[PDB]
């Protein structure tokens, strides 16, 4: 009985920005879903494919953890449906999702006193994303009918925009840390599942 390292993804000191969400594999474990549900620190624990109270007897071929940091308001855009902006340009969920989303407030940690800069979010893309596609590339993006010769006027704006994350805003704007678990039962021997 060798437990699996979830503690290395939830208590990590640094989380990736939304447009470059971290994507970690987990395999060859005995995952303990008891802690992840009973905990009193989360503020949004949701599961779509399988209700939380029966995760102790479902063996998956593989499991992935996505991790990132989003605005407090926009946490209502991480869902199969419920499209919008962030789910439209940065991280889109597949429609037949079988997984869970865990979002909790981190007002104290991820917000500095004078104004942070390490967190950026995408804007101004050519077309809406497709499920799970990661686009970390930065290229100067065009407004309308104008050649893009490397510089910004009323023609080509730089996509990424910077979060402020001031420590004195209302509850609707302080950062929220999000971890999305995705389960997979591909044709292979079952490895990871609870005791």
């Amino acid at each position, epitope marked *: 009985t060798n437990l699996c390292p979830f503690g290395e993804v939830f208590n*990590a000191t*640094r989380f990736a*920005s939304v447009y*470059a969400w*971290n*994507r*970690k594999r987990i395999s060859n474990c005995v995952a303990d879903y008891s802690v992840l549900y009973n905990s009193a620190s989360f503020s949004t624990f949701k599961c779509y494919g399988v209700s939380p109270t029966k995760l102790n007897d479902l063996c998956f071929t593989n499991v992935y953890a996505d991790s990132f940091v989003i605005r407090g308001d926009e946490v209502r855009q991480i869902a199969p449906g419920q499209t919008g902006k962030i789910a439209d340009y940065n991280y889109k969920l597949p429609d037949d999702f079988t997984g869970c989303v865990i979002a909790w407030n981190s007002n104290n940690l991820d917000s500095k006193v004078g104004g942070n800069y390490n967190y950026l979010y995408r804007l101004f893309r050519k077309s809406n994303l497709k499920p799970f596609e990661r686009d970390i590339s*930065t290229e100067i993006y065009q407004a309308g009918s104008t050649p893009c010769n490397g510089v910004e006027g009323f023609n080509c704006y730089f996509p990424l925009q910077s979060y402020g994350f001031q420590p004195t805003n209302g509850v609707g704007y302080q950062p929220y840390r999000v971890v999305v678990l995705s389960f997979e039962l591909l044709h292979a021997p079952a490895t990871v599942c609870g005791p």
Partner: antibody
Framework: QVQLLESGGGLVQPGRSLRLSCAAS????????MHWVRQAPGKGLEWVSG????????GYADSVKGRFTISRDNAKNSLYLHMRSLRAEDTALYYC????????????????????WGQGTTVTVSS | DIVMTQSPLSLPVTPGEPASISCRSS???????????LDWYLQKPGQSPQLLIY???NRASGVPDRFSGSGSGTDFTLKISRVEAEDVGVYYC?????????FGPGTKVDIKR
């Protein structure tokens, strides 16, 4: 053997962009926090930026904050640095270094120990 | 936003004697764990720099046992017990506590005559 190869150097006029790339080969790229460190011509070193083991940046230097943008990719074992709105004072070599302590091997997570260094490029700016 | 200093600024050493270099900070780097986060780095003339000491005094891997690190609070020192012909170049001390990190101005070690 561990290798750290960087590319992207070349003359660039002021007020443009560049995209330096550092590729690592010979270790588990996900258990080491990378760093990008400049080196002025005939002067001392200077820390520029870094990235932890979960693609979470750790802040930039005080005088450069506002333009540089770091990014990572564990699938392709790569670390990219986009650089916008240059000035004449950003000509220097650039090394990409690796941390020493593997994560969760012993309080907090490790960030120090820039042990292995690739041979840096020679970015320059002039008109 | 932490500023260091080093001393002496430049010293000439002769092969076969120890030498001592001091790095000083502004805020004591004693973390909650009780570890000082200073690191000592070396650069040879014409090559990429290399690591000497990490975590205050824990000796780095692959370097000989001729180096020693000590100190705490806001003052740390590096001592080379038996200097030789292959110990010339520049030395730096780097913090690891409060981002952004910083490098000292650098000590220039050369051969005396």
């Amino acid at each position: 053997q561990v290798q750290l190869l960087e590319s992207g150097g070349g003359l660039v006029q002021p007020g443009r962009s560049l995209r330096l790339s550092c590729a690592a080969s010979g270790f588990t790229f996900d258990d080491y926090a990378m760093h990008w460190v400049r080196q002025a011509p005939g002067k001392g070193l200077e820390w520029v930026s870094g990235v932890s083991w979960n693609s979470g940046t750790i802040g930039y230097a005080d005088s450069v904050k506002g333009r540089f943008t770091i990014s990572r990719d564990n699938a392709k074992n790569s670390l990219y640095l986009h650089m916008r709105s240059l000035r004449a004072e950003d000509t220097a070599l650039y090394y990409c270094a690796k941390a020493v302590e593997m994560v969760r091997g012993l309080g907090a997570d490790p960030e120090y120990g820039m042990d292995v260094w690739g041979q840096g490029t020679t970015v320059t700016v002039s008109s | 936003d932490i500023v260091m200093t080093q001393s002496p600024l430049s010293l000439p050493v002769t092969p076969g004697e120890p030498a001592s270099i001091s790095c000083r900070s502004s805020q004591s780097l004693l973390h909650s764990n009780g570890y000082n986060y200073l690191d000592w780095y070396l650069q040879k003339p014409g090559q990429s720099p290399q690591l000497l000491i990490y975590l205050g005094s824990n000796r780095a891997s692959g370097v000989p046992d001729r180096f020693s690190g000590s100190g705490s609070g806001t003052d740390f020192t590096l001592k080379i017990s038996r200097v030789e012909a292959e110990d010339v170049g520049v030395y730096y001390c780097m913090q690891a506590l409060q981002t952004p990190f910083t490098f000292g101005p650098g000590t220039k070690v050369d051969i005396k005559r």
